[PDB]
């Protein structure tokens, strides 16, 4: 067994890589297996991800909201873009983050230019607008902010230190070091 | 060159060509030529010939503004192809002076573009794409004389015209037959 | 065993990747095995796919319509192009989707230019037209729309939220979260 | 240049060359030259020489429109190769003035293109491909004098002609023998 | 060339074009032209026409410095597009002589750049980015007459203007209508 | 078993490769497994890394500070950039280095240019500044320097020989050769 | 060209431009122009205008040597940007004749380079990098009048100046205000 | 088992590939395992390497000097640059080389240009100078040369035949063929 | 087991690929294992190699000359450049070749240009000259030629048919077909 197989025996999934469809289908497959192995024991989800992806975000957003088990998110070094939404998507009272982890909340973007007629670009922009409102509505029900506050805050990159990510509501506890180590 | 010397001799006869994609280089070359020919004789017609696969909106709006603000009557000529910004500048000629050569084909379609960046950038681009597309359709409705609701319906996708179809639609005023 | 092997033991196949011939032959091989293991138990098909492919679509469209088992489709984060047709291709009463999954119905396209003489392009266009009518005839027998309504709706990209994908008829239930999680 | 100075000296003798693929640059150069030579002498023949592997339909329709609408009689000359839009502009010359040099080879074939985009875009392109191919075949039937059903049958794939085969088919009116 | 000969003939009529992205090559070409035209007649207006997608800040500050320090009144003309450094040099014209052609579109946005290197290098770049952005916003507040707090609020992201919106905002003083 | 599997049985992890997210998630998975196997036995962490990465640094900085086991860092040939911070991040009294290992402390940089508007670059520079202060605050609590001294020292590349890395406070012992060998 | 004809007409008015990165091509072009203008009139000022992002040390030392050894007084002008070898040649002008246009920005920084090859090659390069950096800092201390210990402290990393900051630092002697 | 697994059972490690960090961490993992399996039995180290790498050199230089076992180096076909230092780094009385093996001692270089300000290049050159002195100080304590002699000899490439590499002091015995073969 | 594992049980190694360091370290590992399994039983070495490499040549030249077992070389289809030297490097009385195998003896070359100062190129050329003399001295002690004859013969490519490679002395027997087959 790997370490990654050993953490999964203790119901811990790594996000680790960026949230694309390949990573989202991995995490959804891991969240549903861990739901079936013990639905009343908390899945822990370690997040060191640079973000990326919205449908892949909302694939593993909805799955960690679907499953019978409570999700404990732990931000390791980084939760940027989509991964900060997944960090807030843990169960309240859960959602740890290590003390030097940065949390980068950020409005949705298009990676590169997508061409098309203006009637096709009015739809790709009505979609990136409803991707923006869905990013802010999701992040408001998990941080307790007012979803126009998040639109003002995620208007640019807002890098949150873990101590000011629990003041923002992204996490709940900046988890302390166990032994001085 | 040779091809620049033939264009220079037609420029002496007040015949300019839009023969490429309308980018900022060809537009500033035409806007320079329209300003130069309106400075030589302010009362003699300029014969712009359109053989264009389209181009940039703002490049063609630079040409269209210099076509209007020149005291000359810009006679336009669909020569083979007047697509996108080429049909716009074709239909932008003086009324009674917009011509199609009999086998020119006129492509009318809504502007293409590309959305880029963050969702606040894209919401500004799409706000501006709705401004550009409304003004492009307002001017095509002004040029052709068609209703703007018909302009936005026909120019949803590619809407090809022959010289005889563009005559009855309103892009050109005559078809040259000699 | 992987999680993916564990979901397949519980008769769940991921679409996950885009629908190309490599992915279609995988899903057809998975649908026929799960038909042979228990033909009277519902195959579940998880769809997080960006679409793509029409013959690969109709390969796994026809197979999930062929098999003795009812197919339960679940849209995870995305069902675009072909995937949305496969999402509607589940059994009626089945066809779930997670609440923040987008469903992108979309007329068939050619990825890039295919050259040829006009007599060869009249055939590639009579094919992309009958690919369009087959996309609309398939999506009309599974959504209950009138197949000219779908031609008007899939004329551009129509991104459906899951709540308005069951109003469209693509899915049947936006499936609720089990525990608050 | 040298090659531009020799072309300029032949342009003084009203001999223009279609010597490349007919794209919008060479077409607008020829359309400029036909307009320039029809402005010098309106009653003297222009000797276009075709050495062309074909080209764009709309580029060649720009040339064909300027060949017709010029008051000059455009004498055309198949010089080595008159393929695709090159055979079209060869056969587009004035009747009695379409020549083939004795070892020129004339390639007649239906237009090539490419379908792109969504199925509603492609259904418009193929609708327009049927318009272009019908008009290209109508004009080849007008030029050669062949029936349009024979034009569409011969120009299904590549249909090569020698100078003597193109004479009896109808692309050229004579073969230069001096 | 042809396009250089038409620009040279407009340069004789004191009409220079900013028609590209404002980089150091186009800026030094315009700064050369403004110095050359201010040396011919020190009391006659220079008609700069802006068709520009923006450009470098320091390149446009070179043009803006030569526009101010020339004894001529630099009349500016939004011709199709004045985006970024193009709107800056548009609004940098002499008051009463900043024109927009009626379909020109003015894009106002804060400067783009890129941070590079070590954290001590980047802290100097961002210190200088705050200097450039404050001076760019101070001058746009000076040109338009808007408050600098409104300039920094509107020019946060892309802020598009029509010719009539830029007239009431303050970039241009008139709209050419002839 | 590999040698790498054999060193991990003796609770030794290699850093080895540069600190990116792929390497950080490996080391965090290894540090948490070795914490769970025996939380009161010292994890050894071998560092031959050229550095790189700050969020990946602070991912495995925080984890080696989190775990119940004391971390013994050993610099093998190189601890450059982020890896020198991880070298100092071992437990005091631990933190060895081989006698010809170089330690390259270094202020954070951006690999290549990141474009954007100035309001977006004021945030990427306020982040690389707080990445710089966090690099110096972390390296001051582990070397005992005054964090403005480290700003003066890491202003350029400061390559420390192991004998002058214990004078700097990065390591504690330049560990002697066992047999002459 | 056009841009070469405007530069040639300013060269007749003894106005040369350093408008690019100072490489050996632009340096040998300026050194040729300084030698050509010092041969026409040995007693009339040469107005070098700096719009430069920097460049090579040895290329700029070629210009600086021809600026000193010309009998003309090289008036220098920071036009938009006088970075690196551009600020060096700006400050290398005749005292009383080093000007900054009011929005030019002066970047002062130590020379960049690259070490290559074996450790005996690099020990020679770094020996020579210490010679170049000491001589560059000695001349900036001579030009500005600042101490060489302040020159090496400010020019450790990028040290940006406005036109008013470079005036009090010593790069320029005046700021042009007309 | 491979042949490489079979040679390692007889306490033989191949250098084989060039000395980069991937190869250095392999050899250090192999040297420490073979130290733990039997610390009083001689590790043999076969060297057919084209060299490369200085921190990776001094990683496996220090490890073969650290371990309790004596190291027997054998140059197979080539010990260039770094690998010639490792060839001399064997135990005295050990350090064989095959009769047609070339030994290429060579001063440290930079593979390609590294850019930077001159204050950053004064440090990369003070490092490649102390990499040069450390290459010469290491090669002087193992060959018995005077470390200015090695600076004169490694000023260019000095390719040593095995018979003149024991005269130089790099190896001790040019080992004879066992049977005529 | 593969066929290659089966031939190695019968003490046959393939050269097969070109002689680079990766192939030389494989063959040296195979020659030393087969020496240890039975040092008095003849290792057979099948050579279908296009050559290449001189230090990799002299790595497996010296090893097949080192080992206690006699080496039987068999040229299969080709022994070019370095592999023809290895073909002659078998034991006398051994060194077969199949009847249509070509043997290409050839002076050493540099693959591509190596740059440098002339004092560095006087050393790379004194090395390719002593690589040439070592190629000719090795090929003279195994063919019985006079080493100036080989310099005249390998001055260009000398492709030897197997029947004229035993006249040259490269091989000893052109081995006959067993059954007509
Ligand atoms: C903050 C959350 C919402 C995610 C952030 N951005 C997005 O929403 C991502 C960014 C992205 C990633 C890959 C390719 C294109 C765009 N948005 C999307 O995935 C996306 C997909 N289709 C259309 C529009 N946006 B993150 O990637 O910065
Ligand atoms: C004329 C209109 C109706 C249709 C097309 N015009 C456009 O939309 C072109 C698209 C284009 C052209 C050249 C380079 C880049 C982009 N206009 C533009 O440049 C453009 C694109 N997006 C927004 C505003 N303007 B046509 O000219 O291709
Ligand atoms: C909505 C369903 C029908 C699928 C959508 N489009 C298609 O039908 C796909 C899109 C596609 C994918 C890959 C390469 C080229 C084209 N069409 C085809 O696969 C296809 C294949 N051969 C000819 C014409 N179309 B999807 O890919 O947007
Ligand atoms: C000309 C007729 C007889 C047949 C052939 N025509 C074509 O293939 C050309 C293809 C081409 C050539 C050069 C540049 C751009 C496009 N036809 C067209 O221009 C074309 C193709 N599709 C739609 C409209 N026009 B020939 O030129 O090879
Ligand atoms: C005029 C301002 C307010 C708006 C935009 N400016 C910029 O983004 C330009 C970017 C650019 C453009 C072309 C070449 C080089 C750099 N700003 C700069 O020149 C710049 C960038 N970083 C630091 C200092 N100046 B415009 O160019 O779109
Ligand atoms: C000394 C420690 C802090 C690490 C050093 N530098 C950093 O902090 C690294 C250097 C680096 C590596 C890869 C890509 C971009 C930048 N900084 C970052 O990782 C980083 C990431 N996002 C924004 C800003 N910096 B090391 O990489 O020189
Ligand atoms: C000029 C002084 C103030 C500082 C900077 N100089 C340099 O970085 C330039 C780098 C450069 C630039 C263009 C072409 C070739 C080399 N310095 C040199 O030319 C140089 C570098 N190393 C040794 C000798 N000369 B500036 O030009 O960026
Ligand atoms: C005795 C050895 C060390 C001498 C030569 N090797 C080196 O000097 C090697 C070759 C190399 C590898 C990567 C990047 C730059 C240089 N030097 C280094 O490892 C190195 C690393 N950082 C700075 C300076 N040199 B040899 O392998 O050519
Ligand atoms: C005939 C025997 C000696 C080998 C022949 N040639 C050589 O000696 C080979 C040819 C070769 C192969 C790969 C890369 C560069 C050069 N020479 C070398 O390996 C070599 C290596 N370093 C310096 C000089 N020559 B064979 O490769 O043609």
GROMACS .gro file of N, CA and C in nm, chain C residues 58 61-62 64-65 84-93 95 134-145 150 165 168-172:
model
  105
  417UNK      N    1  -2.368   0.773  -3.001
  417UNK     CA    2  -2.469   0.676  -3.040
  417UNK      C    3  -2.422   0.533  -3.024
  420UNK      N    4  -2.514   0.545  -2.656
  420UNK     CA    5  -2.658   0.565  -2.648
  420UNK      C    6  -2.731   0.435  -2.675
  421UNK      N    7  -2.694   0.367  -2.783
  421UNK     CA    8  -2.765   0.247  -2.822
  421UNK      C    9  -2.742   0.134  -2.724
  423UNK      N   10  -2.683   0.160  -2.387
  423UNK     CA   11  -2.763   0.182  -2.268
  423UNK      C   12  -2.912   0.175  -2.298
  424UNK      N   13  -2.950   0.184  -2.424
  424UNK     CA   14  -3.086   0.151  -2.463
  424UNK      C   15  -3.103   0.003  -2.493
  443UNK      N   16  -2.515   1.516  -2.252
  443UNK     CA   17  -2.651   1.554  -2.216
  443UNK      C   18  -2.752   1.463  -2.283
  444UNK      N   19  -2.719   1.411  -2.401
  444UNK     CA   20  -2.804   1.314  -2.467
  444UNK      C   21  -2.802   1.183  -2.391
  445UNK      N   22  -2.685   1.145  -2.340
  445UNK     CA   23  -2.673   1.025  -2.257
  445UNK      C   24  -2.741   1.043  -2.123
  446UNK      N   25  -2.744   1.166  -2.073
  446UNK     CA   26  -2.814   1.194  -1.949
  446UNK      C   27  -2.963   1.177  -1.965
  447UNK      N   28  -3.018   1.225  -2.076
  447UNK     CA   29  -3.159   1.202  -2.105
  447UNK      C   30  -3.186   1.058  -2.144
  448UNK      N   31  -3.084   0.984  -2.184
  448UNK     CA   32  -3.099   0.847  -2.230
  448UNK      C   33  -3.119   0.747  -2.118
  449UNK      N   34  -3.121   0.790  -1.993
  449UNK     CA   35  -3.154   0.699  -1.886
  449UNK      C   36  -3.300   0.661  -1.887
  450UNK      N   37  -3.333   0.568  -1.801
  450UNK     CA   38  -3.470   0.521  -1.788
  450UNK      C   39  -3.555   0.633  -1.730
  451UNK      N   40  -3.679   0.651  -1.775
  451UNK     CA   41  -3.768   0.748  -1.711
  451UNK      C   42  -3.797   0.710  -1.566
  452UNK      N   43  -3.801   0.811  -1.480
  452UNK     CA   44  -3.807   0.790  -1.337
  452UNK      C   45  -3.672   0.785  -1.271
  454UNK      N   46  -3.260   0.902  -1.408
  454UNK     CA   47  -3.202   1.027  -1.460
  454UNK      C   48  -3.201   1.135  -1.353
  493UNK      N   49  -3.085   1.340  -3.576
  493UNK     CA   50  -3.081   1.225  -3.486
  493UNK      C   51  -3.054   1.268  -3.344
  494UNK      N   52  -2.978   1.376  -3.325
  494UNK     CA   53  -2.960   1.431  -3.191
  494UNK      C   54  -3.092   1.485  -3.138
  495UNK      N   55  -3.173   1.544  -3.226
  495UNK     CA   56  -3.299   1.602  -3.184
  495UNK      C   57  -3.410   1.499  -3.174
  496UNK      N   58  -3.407   1.395  -3.257
  496UNK     CA   59  -3.507   1.289  -3.246
  496UNK      C   60  -3.483   1.206  -3.122
  497UNK      N   61  -3.356   1.178  -3.091
  497UNK     CA   62  -3.322   1.108  -2.968
  497UNK      C   63  -3.359   1.189  -2.846
  498UNK      N   64  -3.327   1.318  -2.847
  498UNK     CA   65  -3.354   1.401  -2.732
  498UNK      C   66  -3.502   1.437  -2.722
  499UNK      N   67  -3.582   1.410  -2.825
  499UNK     CA   68  -3.725   1.432  -2.813
  499UNK      C   69  -3.799   1.312  -2.758
  500UNK      N   70  -3.751   1.191  -2.783
  500UNK     CA   71  -3.819   1.075  -2.728
  500UNK      C   72  -3.785   1.055  -2.581
  501UNK      N   73  -3.684   1.125  -2.530
  501UNK     CA   74  -3.644   1.113  -2.392
  501UNK      C   75  -3.680   1.233  -2.307
  502UNK      N   76  -3.707   1.348  -2.368
  502UNK     CA   77  -3.754   1.464  -2.294
  502UNK      C   78  -3.901   1.492  -2.316
  503UNK      N   79  -3.962   1.431  -2.417
  503UNK     CA   80  -4.101   1.460  -2.445
  503UNK      C   81  -4.123   1.590  -2.518
  504UNK      N   82  -4.017   1.653  -2.567
  504UNK     CA   83  -4.031   1.772  -2.648
  504UNK      C   84  -4.059   1.732  -2.793
  509UNK      N   85  -3.656   2.138  -2.975
  509UNK     CA   86  -3.517   2.112  -2.943
  509UNK      C   87  -3.425   2.172  -3.049
  524UNK      N   88  -3.321   2.165  -1.593
  524UNK     CA   89  -3.306   2.050  -1.681
  524UNK      C   90  -3.415   1.946  -1.658
  527UNK      N   91  -3.695   2.098  -1.846
  527UNK     CA   92  -3.676   2.072  -1.987
  527UNK      C   93  -3.706   1.927  -2.021
  528UNK      N   94  -3.690   1.838  -1.925
  528UNK     CA   95  -3.712   1.697  -1.947
  528UNK      C   96  -3.587   1.614  -1.959
  529UNK      N   97  -3.469   1.676  -1.947
  529UNK     CA   98  -3.343   1.603  -1.955
  529UNK      C   99  -3.331   1.506  -1.839
  530UNK      N  100  -3.356   1.553  -1.718
  530UNK     CA  101  -3.352   1.470  -1.599
  530UNK      C  102  -3.492   1.463  -1.541
  531UNK      N  103  -3.508   1.380  -1.439
  531UNK     CA  104  -3.637   1.368  -1.373
  531UNK      C  105  -3.636   1.424  -1.233
   0.00000   0.00000   0.00000
